[model samples]
Target: SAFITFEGPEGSGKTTVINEVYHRLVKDYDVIMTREPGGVPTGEEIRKIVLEGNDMDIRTEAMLFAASRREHLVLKVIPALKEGKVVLCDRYIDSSLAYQGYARGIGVEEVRALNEFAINGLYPDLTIYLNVSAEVGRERIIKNSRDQNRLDQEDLKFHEKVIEGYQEIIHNESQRFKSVNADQPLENVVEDTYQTIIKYLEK
Candidate 1:
């Protein structure tokens, strides 16, 4: 009954809580987990480049993101949607909008249009937004002791703008977004998100 996408900063606990919730959802529903830039072979290849493969110009990077998303949506996401399964996506257009679009100085509307073209206007029925301050998120990421990536190398201020960018994106869009406090304890965050799904279904 839904295409649900998750969005948050690196340390926002989006992935950890999503993993917990996916197990719970699978007991009574057909659930599929996926992420952008790498749902299929070609997309996966492109994802490798975008995430760690090479350092290219901004336009090329943005183009690659769109290209990967196009292939992924056509090959995997669309089919799952048509089959009436619960598609749990790790990230979607919002990531591009916040990172490449706003944070990287690519126009937000420009990235939105690019993504719209990529997917032919297919959007998640619900987007779960995990909100946490950029500073706090960075602290958590360091405490997690995980290896950093290219994107993670960006300065604190870059992520702050990423947070600000999302605020602008979600403004006045209460109908499309379900918000949760990622700053809260992980248990509460997971429970809150689980309940959000239930509420979304009821809606």
Candidate 2:
């Protein structure tokens, strides 16, 4: 069993990729898939306010996210982990480090500190960092039919900074992270991600 988290810019095929991985894993493994900031009822409330609230201060935004994360950990993620299930999460503290700390100029270390406290030392055993160009991600988001979230409304410069943040994050934890080139064809991305996960599965 493992706690695996997926991280990447928007439109990096996360939903599509994770869905495929989920299907393949369920054949033999006890798996649970969830997302940060909305994994439980309380977290869902926080997710909406963060995504839709226009008047939030940057610090408040960070705290709200951390609060949501804490609730999810206690109510949903931790239980699944205790049962020895393969827990797949869409995002986690890294998103805050990128978007709020790096992109929004809130400072990564500070946000990470809050999250560290919120989680009280729990971290994923493996993280899949899907690398895709900011330009490509933005283009894909535009071409899609989904309504844009608050973070999506930020300018290209903001998104680019988030990518740079991911780089810094990877520099610090290269061994724990599996970097996947997400600009590839859909089938290839899914296969590559699956291949990466299979190593742990086989253990």
Candidate 3:
């Protein structure tokens, strides 16, 4: 089974790109594409409460994400992987490490330990880190005419911290984390990301 995740700060165009990739891959392989906090019905409810409710603290939000993730794994991811499918998750444990651990100052190790407990040490085989400047990413998100989530409304500094958080993850897990230039044109980004995945698949 091939488990792959796409992760980065806001407005890196991961969702759109991943959807495209999923369509391309599903023709050739058993593929499952999902986003964090919302894979199964139960997980979708959890995601709504976490993102729409503002009364919770950072830790609470983190735990909620973890819970949703656990449900996702049990209800969707694990089943697909067990069937020898290629799972392409939009955001996974790395998002928690960047958002709750690094940006929220909860400590990555602690968050990771909690995640380990939640998922029982199931990590992505490959994580595509969409590397983009915080400033540029935030600008793209802010200028978007669509509805912004609670996290999206955060300040630029907060997003910068998220970028730093992702960088730290990349540095720490150099082999598993593949960095791609998300600031490039969509065509270039897609080609580069595809090349990276092909290289890993060869391995």
Candidate 4:
């Protein structure tokens, strides 16, 4: 059993890529795909609150996300892991570390402490970092049809800080992270990620 997570900025095509990768992986290995602050009813409720609450305090927002994550882990992730399936999650503790911690100035350690308490020290076996420039990501977001969330309204500088935070996280745990250049076309990007994950699974 293994847990893997995908991390990236707003328009890094995580959802699309994860979908394709999941289908490809499922052909050989037992795998499940889900997203953070979702996948379960309670988590989705918390997700709605977090997405729509414009005036929520930063710490309050962080705490709420942690709560949702806890429920998601208990109801979904842990169950899949226990069955020896590869759990491919989109956004996990690292999202909070990047968006809330470094970008929001909440402090990575503080956010990590809160998440660790919530998750009981569970971290992904491998984290795929989709490396895309802030500008390119912002451009893609603008071009997309989906409604923007409270967090998506931030300026480019905040997104840059989020990327910077991921760099720091990768530096601290270099062995756990594998970076994929997301600036390429969709087909190539998906193939790169698929192969990277297969290699890891085999190892």
Candidate 5:
């Protein structure tokens, strides 16, 4: 069993790609797709407040994320992993380390420390970073006409920092990260991610 997480900026087509890949993989293997600030009722409510609340203290915000993650992990992820199923999570610890830690200027290490306590070292065995430019991500978000969360409302510069933050994390944890260029067509993105996960599954 492997815990696989997807990391990317706001509009890297993470949801689209993950959904397609999950279908492809599930045809051959036992798998489940879930997401953070999700998979549990408490976490979703926490995310609602975290995203909607303005002028929130940075530490408090980070703590809320950790709390939410802990609930999702304990209630959902760990159970799926225990069933010997492949877990494809939309976002996990890296998101917090990137968004709240790096992009929000909370210090990656500090936020990581907080998350480390929350997750209890149950990090993803593999992470797929859907790499794309901030410009491209911004364009996709605008075209999608979907509901925008507070974080999604951030300016281009902020999204750029999020990319930088993910790069730094991938650099530090090279063994766990496999980046796929997400600037291409949806077909290529899904096929590339499907192949990557196939290799990992066989391993």
Candidate 6:
């Protein structure tokens, strides 16, 4: 089964594009569209604690995310994949690696080791990375009026670090990660994303 993931900094339109892709795929395949740390009940609870509690230490937050991820994998993602369904995860280990590891200054390698343990080294077959400027992304997010979540409230520098982290990921894993121009207009972004997925499917 094809396992895909959508990844990006806040306001990069990952959700919008993923939703479009999911709808397109659902007509042809058994598709599972879910987000991390909240795909299941237990995971959602973990997400609430992590997002609502800002006083938690970095390590503590990382651990909670990992735990949530493990539960999400075991209870939702893995099962769907096992059933030969196409799984489209909104975010995955890459987000933690970028947000908690790089942006939070917790060391990507260390976070990756913990994540490897959490998911037993399970990686998505394809990762659609929405690349956008930190400032632009944050502005869009701020306009949305969503609860600033722990990561969302971070400063511009922090968001830049996250972009750097994602850049490193894309550079290192060019074969598995595809970068899309999220700076474009929404309709163009969606079309570009759709074409990218079609290319992969046609392969």
Name the best candidate (by lDDT). Answer: 5
Off by over 4 Å in 2: 48-54, 145-154
Candidate 6 lDDT score relative to the true structure: 0.84
Q: Which ten residues in a row have the lowest lDDT in candidate 5?
A: 145-154
102-164 per-residue lDDT for model 3 (tens digits): 998999998998888888988889999889887668767866647764334457678888999
Error of 6 at 182 (Å): 0.6
Find the number of clashing residue pairs for candidate 3.
Answer: 0
Candidate 6 structure, TM-score to reference: 0.88
Model 2, range 1-203, lDDT digits (tens) per residue?
68899998876888899989989988878997886754488988986787898887889878988888899989988888898898999989888889888888888888888879988989888888888888777776776747754334456667788889998899886676989898887788899999899886786
Give the alpha carbon lDDT tens digit for every residue of 1-203 in model 6: 77888999977988788988788777876787887754489988986787999688889888988988899999988888899888888989899899888988899899999989998978988889999887678777776757754344447677788898998888896687989999887788888988887788768
TM per candidate: 0.90, 0.89, 0.88, 0.89, 0.90, 0.88
On lDDT, the stronger of 1 and 2 is 2
Question: Residue-pair clashes per candidate, as listed?
Answer: 0, 0, 0, 0, 0, 0
Model 5 clash number: 0
lDDT for every model?
A: 0.82, 0.84, 0.82, 0.86, 0.87, 0.84
lDDT of 5 by residue, 1-203 (tens): 89999989988999999999998888899998986756499988887778998998989888987888898998888988999999999988889889999999999889989989999989788899999888788788777866753335457789889999988888876788999999988799999999998998888
Q: What is the lDDT of residue 173 in candidate 2?
A: 63
Candidate 4 off by > 4 Å = 48-54, 145-154
Estimate, for each residue in 1-203, the C-alpha lDDT of model 1 and write its tens digit. 58899998778998898898788888877887885644499988886786784567887788887888888888888888889888999988888898888988889988888888887878889999998877668777777865753235546778788888888788858677878899988899999998998777766
Instruction: Mark the 10 consecutive residues where model 2 has the least summed lDDT.
Output: 145-154
Question: Model 5, 76: alpha-carbon shift in Å?
Answer: 1.1
Rank all candidate structures by their lDDT, best first, as comma-separated numbers: 5, 4, 6, 2, 1, 3
What's the alpha carbon RMSD for model 3? 3.0
CA RMSD of all predictions:
2.8, 2.9, 3.0, 3.0, 3.0, 3.1
